[PDB]
Amino acid sequence: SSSIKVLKGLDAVRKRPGMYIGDTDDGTGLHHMVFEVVDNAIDEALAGHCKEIIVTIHADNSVSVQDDGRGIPTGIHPEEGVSAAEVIMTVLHGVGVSVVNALSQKLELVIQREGKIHRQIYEHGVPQAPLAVTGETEKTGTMVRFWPSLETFTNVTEFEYEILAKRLRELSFLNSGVSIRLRDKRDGKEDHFHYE
Numbered sequence: 001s002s003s004i005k006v007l008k009g010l011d012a013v014r015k016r017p018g019m020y021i022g023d024t025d026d027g028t029g030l031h032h033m034v035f036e037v038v039d040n041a042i043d044e045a046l047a048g049h050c051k052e053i054i055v056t057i058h059a060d061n062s063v064s065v066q067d068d069g070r071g072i073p074t075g076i077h078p079e080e081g082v083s084a085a086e087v088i089m090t091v092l093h094g095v096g097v098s099v100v101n102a103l104s105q106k107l108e109l110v111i112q113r114e115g116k117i118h119r120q121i122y123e124h125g126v127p128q129a130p131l132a133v134t135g136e137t138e139k140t141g142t143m144v145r146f147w148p149s150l151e152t153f154t155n156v157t158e159f160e161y162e163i164l165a166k167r168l169r170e171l172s173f174l175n176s177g178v179s180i181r182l183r184d185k186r187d188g189k190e191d192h193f194h195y196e
């Protein structure tokens with residue numbers, strides 16, 4: 001019913017990715033996938049709940065963004081039949097994570113909130129299962145890790161550290177007070193962005 005519109009939106013995006021993410025052969029859209037997710041963590045930092053953000057380039061050519069904010073609300077949003085988090089990750093409308101989720105072959109969500117750790121896995125924007133609790137924790141935050149769909153992205157398929165590094169530096173300048181870490185698991189290089 002609402003799943004109907006969601007899958008409609010997901011179609012829409014995988015069908016015309018240039019309309020939402022940008023160019024799929026350039027590097028431009030692929031890297032925009034990261035900034036869209038980081039964008040979301042910056043909102044949580046503009047709300048005064050997030051102090052540090054961690055962008056990691058993993059060795060299998062996936063990227064993750066971790067914040068120590070509140071964590072996305074997990075309560076089943078009882079108009080639709082699923083966690084508020086799932087609605088955030090899957091509904092269309094800065095374009096929203098659902099664009100990134102739709103063009104990701106795989107996407108892992110981990111939320112730490114009200115003393116629990118919740119995990120959900122998606123494939124091409126579609127949940128494997130409802131948001132489920134995997135254990136206790138005393139910290140809070142949201143972590144989104146995604147693997148770009150190779151059906152969508154070609155040519156430039158690998159993330160460039162210096163392209164992220166540049167945009168993350170810029171975003172730290174524009175949002176005074178946030179701290180951002182970039183780590184490349186491939187060769188160990190790190191950097192830290194913070195403009196007092």
Ligand SMILES: CNc1cccc2cc(C(=O)Nc3cccc(CC(=O)O)c3)c(=O)[nH]c12
Nearest residue numbers: 040041044065066067069070071072142144
């Ligand atoms: C990497 N981090 C990361 C990635 C992708 C998406 C998100 C989304 C959120 C998020 O929607 N958070 C949030 C927290 C509490 C209450 C509400 C509802 C509200 O009051 O506006 C929203 C986040 O925190 N982090 C995200």
